[model samples]
Target chain A: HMADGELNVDSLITRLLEVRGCRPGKIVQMTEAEVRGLCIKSREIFLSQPILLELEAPLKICGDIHGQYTDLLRLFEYGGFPPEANYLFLGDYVDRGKQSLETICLLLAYKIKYPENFFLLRGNHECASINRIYGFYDECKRRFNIKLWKTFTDCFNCLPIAAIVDEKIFCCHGGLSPDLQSMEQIRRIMRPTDVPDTGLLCDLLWSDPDKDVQGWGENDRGVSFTFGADVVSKFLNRHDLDLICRAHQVVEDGYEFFAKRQLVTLFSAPNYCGEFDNAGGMMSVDETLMCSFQILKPSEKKAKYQYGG
Target chain B: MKMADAKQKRNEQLKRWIGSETDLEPPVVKRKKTKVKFDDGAVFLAACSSGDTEEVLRLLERGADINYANVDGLTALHQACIDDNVDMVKFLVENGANINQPDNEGWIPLHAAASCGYLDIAEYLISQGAHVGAVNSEGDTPLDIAEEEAMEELLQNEVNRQGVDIEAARKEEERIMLRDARQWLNSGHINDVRHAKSGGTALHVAAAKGYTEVLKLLIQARYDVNIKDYDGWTPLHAAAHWGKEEACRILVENLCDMEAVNKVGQTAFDVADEDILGYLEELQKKQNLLH
Candidate 1:
């Protein structure tokens, strides 16, 4: 018994865009049903697509936003708004900044509006168990209710875990998973699932690249594995991929290269959580698969804050 | 590999591969930015998207369709709403753009304003008699998808105001809901489901949402009005607590027990808003105990 089953999705997208405009100081506000409508529609689309989403280039790839709504807006202004440019976001949309709801809702709205061009990858924070304690749940309970938070949990569970661009670049929230042997293995990953303790899915959203370790090593985060430059080179060679793009760790440069440029880490939330003095970054892949970095220079105010140390 | 060697290789590799590319950046300096105008509504839509107020006026003066939409159903009003330009929205409305025109997705300008959290524009549209309960093709009202608390409150207050139907808009809503309720009930689907969080069912949801016609249909189907949620809140408690005067009246008249108390030991009378307090007390005499 869906009450607003006849509710127009096009209008829903329009409504969400209205709520999530390019302005600052404007709060993201939607009724419970409005959120549920977005989640349900987006979840279905996520489920329909393959776990390893094959995409084209001339796309802008953004990294972890950690809920910095203004920075997210800034990145959009820099890259061009949805439908104006194809965007592939590498997860971690929630948990550090003040407006995770706004950030995720805006992204989901864009995904629904431009399903083919715009995309979202499941970040480590996309997991309910992770976000439940790290701000997203509190945000929901404070601004809306716990039930709506659960609705988001359901939507995040269905998000595609990884993406391949122009058949050259490999993109994911995390790094190489030992369980990831082939593209078909990622394609076989099921939907409506949660991040498990250990597996290909978990590794895709949790793993990090370590320069020292030649193979899979214990992760500093206490979950997933840390692979070295050799591992990155091996994976790219085996997969016929030229590069690996991921976002999880906070890099000072916003974008960092690992394993002799085989894997690039992009962290888009400048001044992450107002704690780290890190510049944010976005990777641009052209039609010919030529990749470039667009840096959101770290806030100048943070330099003064850091000078005392 | 040594740390310096590794870092040097990484830097060199990054320079060779993912280097600086400025072609994708937003154009800083460009010629013929606004001079090249399209023959169709594209130029007008572009002007609205860019917030070129003077260009918009020029296009309008040239007899451009004030209501013209691109293939995606994006009208000048829709673009203005998306652009968050309240003055432009007011301009379009005053110049005779269809205030409630649904783009290809059946989204009116009000929907765009409400979605973008443009409270001023939304208020302006509402004041101009934009359908407060306008529904898009996905069956969502502008209120259902509105992004801000104040925006939601504005639409909710307007929706609650009685007898202010804009040209039979409320009547069509009633007909549609009544038809849909009948169709749903005719099927095997039950109207009620226990939401695990609040333990509220469809009855409480409909009551709280002020879907009176749907509430009446469910009541006619022998759905119990006194069904309590996890908090012992009956549909009457929901209707009363949510300020749905009409829904509250309907529930009481249908023998929804008024004496029933919630988990906190508060009756529907205790939770009802001041506006409906007198009416609930007045309806007390006609109420009969269902159980």
Candidate 2:
């Protein structure tokens, strides 16, 4: 019978609008009279500025998303958000990747709208030197045609360099630097201004524990650099921390546990740099401080480019 | 005479002993070496036939002719295509295999993959700029071969290989139209719905969805109070009977025609709420008395 297949005109129209990509925030078309009324109502709500609700729940932790906007959206499609309840983003947010501006804007918008639900942290790309080398400077120039790049840099400079959630896991964008005497020294480094010279800032931004173990690496071609296992052991012993989570490398898998699980690196851009075979992922922490990770790969329907080996 | 007779008898006796000894010895025959000849392309052909990617790579690395053909005149890519060894085909091409190398049979690797219905391989080959219009000995192009097989897979692959994301493409286009409509209400562009694909503009789409807020936005954007799609159905006609009561009320309150019929001869009252229909009748009565 046509009854089941019959198209209800109203519902069909509504669906068509949605398919046409209309959302609540950007509704197009309304009379001036209506707009004035709505603006008045919004202003009243804005003045009240009620305190937001807070909760401690299991939350997914995401890392360095260098643009790769479509893949980021695909990850959301696969891993439902509020990521079961809460989400924390460890930020690089911009630079060296296409679509950094859009990525940062979307995240910032979400942060402002859901301040209690979403959290973002600072990473090395949050610096001026890094953004200049990567695509972020050019992207801002292209998208906004303004000196908004300096504004973003200023925002980045204000971000906290590290986070200690639940007084258990220690998280930073990079690892422990040699200049710091202890974890307490790292905490006192102040809002890292310029990429610091060989101290907490340097260790937190540039050091790779996997590559440089036996002093600063030196080869005819280049230097292989990483913090050694001994360094990791000592740092953990000093901090009374069980684990160190960081993001900087484009790990082939979403997450990698290194130095016998003393360190964990999370990368959240699938097919990273539009070249690597890495899958994107995010880590989650529970009320008990136990960690879990979610990974996302390119969808079959997407035309993903890979640098041919 | 006696001396002559003795010499002759010694010579005859020597001859007879030599002949008998020769009969007991083996015959001496000369053995000539046979010449070995291989097809000019045999080495490369053998490499391709055995799926010996290493050998093929070695030959290619050594600057062996990539287009070299055997007696049958098929290039290594053509052979790989027939064998459906995608990896070998990829390697050969990476090493600079000619996609247009036509064999004696006028067949190329594209022909082989198409005929074998290797959709993915065919798609990859096409993406790499394979000559789609190349015809073989049978006078069949790659597309012709695909059609002959009646393979939708091949057609779809070809479409996808051309780099079209059908869904996203549609969504993006709709988004642009909606943006344009908003700009029109702001007087940023001409206020003409005919320029839009559906002839009703963004307001029409929103009205169809029964989104009252979006409808209000469009009205404020300065969208014309009266306009219709190709079917002559105005935004009010679209909103009337669809579902949302609030959207219907908004349109009716805006003085939209409650009795005006569309191409289907269906008025807003015919599909609107019963209470709204009573309101419409009372309004009509009031208008009649004034006239």
Candidate 3:
């Protein structure tokens, strides 16, 4: 069922070799560069098409790819990408970290190539307002001029806001707002655009973390919000949604299941923004839709980057 | 004195006690009723025994002292906790019920919720910043009680009761369906072109129904995405024809031959529109190849 323009074995192999820096020889072997390239290609292929193509597989849902390209590659290596089959990219493909351009390109390229085996949804940072402050929008304008920046924004607006997997899992970039009565309401909102003014959209994009910590975020620069377990349970029960898989927070653990395990937050970009001392990882789902997580690390064979060892 | 006189005198004493013996004349002596301390331990017991949430809330709101110990030195919060009335517990807490306030037995609300298997109440208490490690007279923490009562089982029950288990069940069913799909693919059922309706095999079903999860399973099982049905349609074609946008997207991402033409020569893009069409266009640009 491969598409006419889709990458074939020959092209895939060629790209792989180009990235890995290897030639046909008995002594030649896979290199770190090759692995990183493969990772980029894998992401590119997944993003090449809409997730509507592979309707039969469980997507490895993920969150917040804040331009941590190397960590993303490591996650792919560990999580088995080219997806080992099907996958979903749950937005925030750019911003707040280095390599936003490469990250967005790889994801966009994947959407273009695969269109069937992978899916990309919208996140808060996918917006112009967010990117203006976070990084991607300004960076794109600085690196490739203003037109490329518009292209990225336009593509960002085109991404779906959320998806219901197998009609059981409710996946999105953020959690429900105080006003959202059900998932049906969320779906009724227009897509591929800036978030709406009221209801779930506001909270999904603006709400901050509320767990064991006391009180609201209270920081002037941060989004002022809080959500207790009551709110989460009420939202899930009212919507008949089993689980709310979201991404927005930088969890040190890479993932956290809250509200009695009804909600999950996944942060895929490790060493987020190259500033926070944090771990990075991604999640994979099998045929049964059971989720497993993979953490990224420097490849064992690769020499560590050193100023002068 | 005669017997009749003696009976009348005894009746007068009974009437005084019942407050009915007064008549137009000033009373010789007056009795005073002392004011009762409603916030006392005895009142707490009384309030708890009646399960009067309103009265309890009223007393708490009135600053009747939530931590006022009864004879057992248990606070009103402890009483509400024992009764498992979430509303009352919440009310008490809102009115300054101390989550860590222990009774004479050193048991907190966490202890009450955990031991009684009131998982919902327990979870609420925990979320409210109740001390999970608060030790009771038994030298056990809330988590300790949880383990002793098999809190995992309780939690599972709560989750099941809330219908989260249905999701788990659905996932299991998907796994089984994927297994069936693999069987159909390997059984030569995929090659039969004549039985397009029933003979189309698992891939056809997954594609036609727009079952993304099922399709994913088939892909993992190594079902050839290039496989064509009797109508010469791939999974992508089927998804597009059926308007299964999510399914079509997944297939495209996995490098399904989007440009593959059937016997009549049609691409997956011919059938998609809106976001799907946009996606197809993006794919075209990325591959830099013309259909």
Candidate 4:
């Protein structure tokens, strides 16, 4: 039923590799049974994972992908696709771009195939509240059906929300929360649950770093707080962490350093949604815990919702 | 009486007894400048609590963390203001203490003073830019927590003044939004800086308005100087059309598409005034990329 479930798996990988070879916005027909199989298999694996998925060194940390499938493919090619190099994707795997199905299906396939190496974290769009407002729900309804959307979210529910790299760099989709003071505090957040309206889990996927605020300031977004340099400093000092790496916010050249490089926000989809002429970036942390960033050009082969998909 | 009020009243009534009984004396009733003293053991916090200016100055001079928040996340500024120690407030504000720092509960020094009816300290903080709109965990601003009528009246006047002060504050907020918007475009896009018809971004506005500083900031944020408006005019086109020579230079140095044509089919040089056209021609001659 699944792409690779019946085959030797290389068969599925090769099929998707050819799909990845193409630029985004091309209509690709995907059957419901195949998508259901993908989501179902991915959910089982994700359920076994903890909310704060503990990760070690020798992994590539990425930010938002935003369903820019062509750019996502470029990322795999540039940063070395999973199995060759481990990847921790802070989510938003689907929506906006026409190739939402292609973007997520490929990642789910990769995760199912290499569960140990590919780590997926939940983004704000993973929830129903954000999904309905953003393009993900509509994308699912247009592409296949509502069931497919539900399948993806069910998989999203089990997806871990944060990861710790070498116990030094805390990685998540968004910034830190005042409620989240330690790894234990983060771990206490139960998984396979809906993202909360407020507090730690919500902040995990909503907050941003503010330059002017010394401590914590109310985010203009109205949901999360915009923490300042002092907040990052105090968090790092308190937790004995060296840095925080998050996504959810976009960066022009792919990634931005905040609070004197104590934290970083990476946007992995270059030329985001075809309107932004942005560079996609990813960070590689080696066994020695040294981190290096690599950025690449966005998929310029197409422009914004030219198909209005 | 309310618990907070009874506690406050009891402390005030015992001020004389404590002043005479302990080595850590309160300020003398007759002298506003009376220096409170305390044991060296808890001197840092005690001096802050009692408005001991000399002790605070000495401790801070010895490299104490000026913005240190004690166990309850209360800072020396919070303490001094609560005690109405205007001297220490002046000292801490000058020495780079975060005047607007929030406690664990989001209470700033202003909140501490306003809640305790210290009108003088509350006004002193307002002069130093302590935000009146800052709310605590309970959603109470300093104005909401004023325990006395006189203190409430004073803060209400300041809040009224804030109506006029808010325009400057609105601009600062916009500046911050614009400042961060340039860092990363999609997440940072500001509606205030764009033109809907042309779909012009902040870079286009900066160029059109001859805002060289803003244009420079946008360029530093690595904005696409070659980005086109709905009319196919890049920031270079906007700069050139307006005769903003400095904007043109900045965009050019940042690799703007000089040959980009607008809807009327005019390159920047084609639409420029004679003197500006001559300058563009000279620049074009050096670059030779405009075909």
Q: C-alpha displacement of B241 in model 4, angstroms? A: 26
DockQ of each candidate, alpha-carbon based: 0.01, 0.01, 0.01, 0.01
**Which TM-score values does chain B get in all models?**
0.46, 0.39, 0.38, 0.41
| Fnat for each predicted structure, in order | 0.00, 0.00, 0.00, 0.00
Off by more than 4 A, model 2: A1-57, A211-225, A301-309, B1-291
2 or 3: which has the higher TM-score? 3
CA-lDDT, candidates in order: 0.74, 0.56, 0.56, 0.71
Report the lDDT tens digits of candidate 1 across residue range B137-160: 445677877878999999888877
Clashes of 4: 0
lDDT of 4 by residue, A51-79 (tens): 78888888888888888776777788777
Off by over 4 Å in 4: A1-9, A301-309, B1-291
Task: Give lDDT tens digits, candidate 3, residues B102-208.
Answer: 65555787877887777778878877877655555334556556654566565445444544433343244345556565665556453222332323445655665
Candidates 3 and 4 compared by lDDT, better number: 4
TM-score versus the correct structure, for each prediction: 0.49, 0.42, 0.43, 0.50
How well does candidate 4 score on lDDT at residue A63? Answer: 85
Estimate, for each residue in A71-99, the C-alpha lDDT of model 2 and write its tens digit.
55545544554424576666687776666
Model 2 Cα shift for residue A279 (angstroms): 0.4
- Pairs with steric clashes in candidate 4: none
Better of 1 and 4 by lDDT: 1
